[PDB]
Write a protein that binds this ligand. Structure first.
Ligand SMILES: [Mg+2]
Ligand SMILES: [Mg+2]
Ligand SMILES: [Mg+2]
Ligand SMILES: [Mg+2]
Ligand SMILES: [Mg+2]
Ligand SMILES: [Mg+2]
Ligand SMILES: [Mg+2]
Ligand SMILES: [Mg+2]
Ligand SMILES: [Mg+2]
Ligand SMILES: [Mg+2]
Ligand SMILES: [Mg+2]
Ligand SMILES: [Mg+2]
Ligand SMILES: [Mg+2]
Ligand SMILES: [Mg+2]
Ligand SMILES: [Mg+2]
Ligand SMILES: [Mg+2]
Ligand SMILES: [Mg+2]
Ligand SMILES: [Mg+2]
Ligand SMILES: [Mg+2]
Ligand SMILES: [Mg+2]
Ligand SMILES: [Mg+2]
Ligand SMILES: [Mg+2]
Ligand SMILES: [Mg+2]
Ligand SMILES: [Mg+2]
Ligand SMILES: [Mg+2]
Ligand SMILES: [Mg+2]
Ligand SMILES: [Mg+2]
Ligand SMILES: [Mg+2]
Ligand SMILES: [Mg+2]
Ligand SMILES: [Mg+2]
Ligand SMILES: [Mg+2]
Ligand SMILES: [Mg+2]
Ligand SMILES: [Mg+2]
Ligand SMILES: [Zn+2]
Lengths: 120, 86, 51, 17, 102, 49
RNA sequence: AACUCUUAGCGGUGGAUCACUCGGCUCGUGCGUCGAUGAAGAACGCAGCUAGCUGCGAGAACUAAUGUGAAUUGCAGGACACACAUUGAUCAUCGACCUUUCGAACGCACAUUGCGGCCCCGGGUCCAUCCCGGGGCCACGCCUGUCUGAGGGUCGCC
RNA sequence: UGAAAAUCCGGGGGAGAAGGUGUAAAUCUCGCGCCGGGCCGUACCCAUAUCCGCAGCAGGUCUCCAAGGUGAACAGCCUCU
RNA sequence: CGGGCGCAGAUCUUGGUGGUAGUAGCAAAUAUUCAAACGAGAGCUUUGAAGGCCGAAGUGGAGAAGGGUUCCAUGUGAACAGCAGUUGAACAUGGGUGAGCCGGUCCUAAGGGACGGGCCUACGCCGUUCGGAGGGGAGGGCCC
RNA sequence: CCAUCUAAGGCUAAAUACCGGCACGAGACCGAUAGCGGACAAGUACCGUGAGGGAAAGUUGAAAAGAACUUUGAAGAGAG
RNA sequence: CACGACCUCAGCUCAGACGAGAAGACCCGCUGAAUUUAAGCAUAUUACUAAGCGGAGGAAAAGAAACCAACCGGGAUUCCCCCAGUAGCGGCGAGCGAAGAGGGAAAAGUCCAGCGCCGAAUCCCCGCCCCAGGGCGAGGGACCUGUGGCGUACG
């Protein structure tokens, strides 16, 4: 139940470690009603946060595989798209705002403001 | 009569809990809440009541998904990268 | 009633005859799973730590 | 709790002769 | 044009013109633009309408048919709307400019 | 009444769990600053609608 | 004697006054960003002992990551914490991840946790029907394109 | 002139299906057998102290059950549970 | 030098306290009584006996609406229950509502309200079996 | 006669505004009947069928060292 | 629709997108009162304000003259000072009330249709190849009822 140690493991052993932490948390809820003890109930929060870091590694691993899977695809799932804000997502992209028509391309070529200076 | 002998016949609810504002203002017969305007698509607010607007404005609740926009704005809505590991 | 009956058949491997659900006044649902006659609820309660 | 003050809840009087 | 641009929320009204008349009805034709079509966003002479500031331009007095009713212009005829709208001019001419050293 | 809806019964469950007295260890934790729950309601004096 | 009044001491009642101030008010400056990728608001739930408030969402009083470098605290107590040297307590920051139900709320409706349909998966059934469980979907308006069409509406060829 | 609808059934109808000499089609269980029936409410008060009227307020609040004697009586008076 | 700068009044505002005052009052629907137990404490709790009332259009036994834990057991007697209390609908700690065949769910009644259309500058409103190219079930092997 | 512009199509920064929001600095201001209704579990408790209405409430001490123990009372509450 | 083209109009849980709500101090478009003043009151005033409705942005709106001026002429818009409580409006009563010039802040200008030359030289979608930027396909379309280039009152 270490953060950096659950990443080298594979999907089969992470799930096996996940359910073994849930059967341990279920036995703590049984002791909580049966009276339990000090050294026994204080581990409920420890096991709760353990299944949180085990389940975190599982979630953020399958998304990295999906992001590598949809890499280069023209159409990606909505959750894999950049969620900046509703206004930014509806703005002109860098390609569409850099488009310069053939008229102001010639106007910006020979009528661009030059670097000058006045003596006095 | 019109007083004590008439307050005893009050056993029929007129309003109930709404599904949009959680207030006891959903009229049963009219099928329309009297505080949020449900089921109309627009919430009812009126400028002749500054106190009624102060109780249900943006910010009097939690702002779950909006307090995150305030935190992501101060960095430029950075997404897709990770900090330098140790 | 089908999820509760199927859950206890997996958490403890015990067959259930019928389930009687009930939502307690504090909002918690309480179930009454009656085990099959081949299984004894006194032995199961001692294994899972009820007693 | 109760309000500070509450709203409280007829001779014609015309002598003639 | 306000009645057409409201039914089609995903489009922006460009202009309108007159096509038919009657004693009871008047018939017009409203020109709308899909600001998310690639044939319109990839044209530099049409990207101006794809901006967020032109959202529902026909119901703010920005189209040619609705901008006339605002009564703005240049000259002795249009002193009422010097400063943009008639309410911008009315607000300026009624603000008590209390200077710092008056 | 005896005929309740699930939303009403779920609403009465929360108000029933909010009407609990303040834990004893909270009083010693705050140094008798919070001695009694200021939102205790009685079924005869205060109605929740 | 009592009782009534007056003055002073002391003690009650009561809370003024004074001192204190993590609050308000006012002015100025920099920014100036919500939402069908499910917003604001609301509901319910979440701590070993927890009512409220605050913080969070079944990963629920927080997970990962980075910076910081020894605590949390009411009592416990126990740390895959501490002799960090089985790369880390706490805090801060917050580029990863997660985010129940109602709500523009979107299968149809809602004083109902009511009533449906389609596809796929596992089990019961093993005679593919039916039953249970899981997942992906099914609102309205509109744009481009595809497909399937309709009308002697206007024609062409027979 | 004193309700609608879900739902259910009978008849008319004879389109169709069944096999060629012992069975077939079909059976309104036709005698029995096999499997399944989810979700929500369910405690208590219901009124001279659990509702409303600021309250344990001589007020108000929709119904069911209802004994013996006297008497025309569900009147009044008395009695049993 | 700058003021939110001096109170006895405004049936002044807020807070507090007197005389009246141990005063009015605790007077609707017939009733209590003896002994005992528990207890620091008993006209009032509990048990037994006696004597009475409600007298089956009840002071009885169960529901609807409404209330929302008031239900049940144990403990306490500070506050509250307008005297008291060994008692409580109070306080504290635990517990309690189990359905294929009870009801909701299902049906449309009055009525509400989408769809087409019309209307309104608009948010929206009118209208309800009428009105649109409104038919996405059934059968014969592709028909209807 | 003279002067002036070319209507009924489109775009455009900066000077300008900002009692909302995010983050800051300041005060010849208010000092708990004042200043925001809200210095505190405040739009909370609470009232109304509803729209809405809407409070009161800051301070032990430097450190709880928050009074061991004895004693009277059933206990609050007293004496050391 | 015998077999096709087209026009017009439909259907979908068809491929991919878009609109809704919130907030609303400032901003834009409509709608719109009466208290109040006139010592009454009806026009006027309050006010092209409050409330009501719709739509945005970090600013919005306005904006490159169918302008001002009448001069030895100025030269888009916005803002400040001034013009000015002035010209003027008004039971000419109460009251209301701008603008040119001038001094400053900031300054930036431009694109189509039309006119008609260029073999539609134009664009979207789909399937791809190379390192945000460039090509390919005897693919499918849009379009001659007009795409793109030159060009707009300064010629
Ligand atoms: Mg051109
Ligand atoms: Mg009551
Ligand atoms: Mg004397
Ligand atoms: Mg005196
Ligand atoms: Mg004194
Ligand atoms: Mg959601
Ligand atoms: Mg027949
Ligand atoms: Mg019952
Ligand atoms: Mg009584
Ligand atoms: Mg003063
Ligand atoms: Mg005084
Ligand atoms: Mg009496
Ligand atoms: Mg009687
Ligand atoms: Mg309890
Ligand atoms: Mg009881
Ligand atoms: Mg007891
Ligand atoms: Mg008493
Ligand atoms: Mg008791
Ligand atoms: Mg209680
Ligand atoms: Mg413009
Ligand atoms: Mg501001
Ligand atoms: Mg105050
Ligand atoms: Mg404030
Ligand atoms: Mg202190
Ligand atoms: Mg909007
Ligand atoms: Mg007058
Ligand atoms: Mg007068
Ligand atoms: Mg307004
Ligand atoms: Mg600016
Ligand atoms: Mg602009
Ligand atoms: Mg000029
Ligand atoms: Mg002058
Ligand atoms: Mg005027
Ligand atoms: Zn509501």
């Amino acid at each position: 139940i270490k953060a950096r140690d659950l990443r080298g493991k594979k999907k089969e052993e992470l799930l096996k470690q996940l359910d073994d932490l849930k059967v341990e948390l279920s036995q703590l809820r049984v002791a909580k009603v049966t009276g339990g003890a000090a050294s026994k109930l204080s581990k409920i929060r420890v096991v709760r946060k353990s299944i949180a870091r085990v389940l975190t590694v599982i979630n953020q691993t399958q998304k990295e595989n999906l992001r590598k899977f949809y890499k280069g695809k023209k159409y990606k799932p909505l959750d894999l798209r950049p969620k900046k804000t509703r206004a930014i997502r509806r703005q002109l992209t860098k390609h569409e705002e850099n488009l310069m028509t053939k008229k102001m391309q010639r106007k910006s070529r020979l009528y661009s403001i030059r670097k000058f200076a006045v003596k006095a | 009569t019109k007083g004590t002998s008439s307050f005893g016949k009050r056993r029929n609810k007129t309003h109930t809990l709404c599904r949009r504002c959680g207030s006891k203002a959903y009229h049963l017969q009219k099928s329309t809440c009297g505080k949020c305007g449900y089921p109309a698509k627009r919430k009812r607010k009126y400028n002749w009541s500054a106190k009624a607007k102060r109780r249900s404005t943006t910010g009097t609740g939690r702002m779950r998904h909006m307090k995150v926009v305030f935190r992501r704005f101060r960095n430029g809505f950075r997404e897709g990268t990770v900090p330098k590991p140790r | 009633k089908h999820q509760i009956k199927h859950a206890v058949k997996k958490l403890y491997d015990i067959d259930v005859a019928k389930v009687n659900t009930l939502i307690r006044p504090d909002g918690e649902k309480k179930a009454y799973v009656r085990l099959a006659p081949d299984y004894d609820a006194l032995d199961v309660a001692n294994k899972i730590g009820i007693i | 709790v109760r309000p500070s003050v509450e709203k409280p809840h007829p001779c014609i009087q015309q002598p003639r002769k | 044009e306000e009645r057409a641009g409201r039914h089609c929320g995903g489009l922006r009204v460009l202009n309108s013109y007159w096509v038919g008349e009657d004693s009871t009805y008047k018939f017009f034709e409203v020109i709308l633009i899909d600001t998310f079509h690639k044939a319109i966003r990839r044209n530099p002479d049409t990207q101006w309408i794809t901006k967020a500031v032109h959202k529902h331009r026909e119901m703010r007095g920005l189209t040619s048919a609705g901008k006339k009713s605002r009564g703005l212009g240049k000259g002795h005829k249009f002193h009422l709307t010097i400063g943009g709208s008639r309410r911008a001019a009315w607000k300026r001419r009624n603000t008590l400019q209390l200077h710092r050293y008056r | 009444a005896s005929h309740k809806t699930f939303r009403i019964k779920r609403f009465l469950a929360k108000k029933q769990k909010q009407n609990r007295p303040i834990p004893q260890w909270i009083r010693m934790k705050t140094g008798n600053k919070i001695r009694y729950n200021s939102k205790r309601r009685h079924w005869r004096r205060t109605k929740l609608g």
